[PDB]
């Protein structure tokens, strides 16, 4: 079951795996900066992290609006799947 506690960070998957890391981050920043101020965007090249990304917002209200408003938003011909990131995700701690 996905995380139900609102997190500053949203977890995104089903991203187009053809796009390189830096371009994916620039596009995500363009789409999600409209939900609120972004502190960081985490993308890994690892094999188990492809098609996935984290967006860390300065305020939970921005993350919540992103989750409710950008769910299924089509990018690179693929609808994004968004969840609240796991509370104190081990992945975020290492990546940030
Ligand atoms: Na919606």
UniProtKB/Swiss-Prot annotation:
Signal peptide span: none
Cellular localization per UniProt: Nucleus
Occurrences of domain RRM (ranges): 8-87
Impact noted for substituting residue 13 to V: Abolishes RNA binding
Organism domain of life: Eukaryota
Modified residues (N6-acetyllysine): 58
Result after altering residue 50 to Q: Abolishes RNA binding
Assembly and binders: U1 snRNP is composed of the 7 core Sm proteins SNRPB, SNRPD1, SNRPD2, SNRPD3, SNRPE, SNRPF and SNRPG that assemble in a heptameric protein ring on the Sm site of the small nuclear RNA to form the core snRNP, and at least three U1 snRNP-specific proteins SNRNP70/U1-70K, SNRPA/U1-A and SNRPC/U1-C. Interacts with SFPQ; component of a snRNP-free complex with SFPQ. Interacts with IVNS1ABP (via BACK domain); the interaction is indirect.
Family under the similarity heading: Belongs to the RRM U1 A/B'' family.
Function noted in UniProt: Component of the spliceosomal U1 snRNP, which is essential for recognition of the pre-mRNA 5' splice-site and the subsequent assembly of the spliceosome. U1 snRNP is the first snRNP to interact with pre-mRNA. This interaction is required for the subsequent binding of U2 snRNP and the U4/U6/U5 tri-snRNP. SNRPA binds stem loop II of U1 snRNA. In a snRNP-free form (SF-A) may be involved in coupled pre-mRNA splicing and polyadenylation process. May bind preferentially to the 5'-UGCAC-3' motif on RNAs.
Protein name: U1 small nuclear ribonucleoprotein A
Primary gene name: SNRPA
Residues of the full protein shown: 3 to 98 of 282
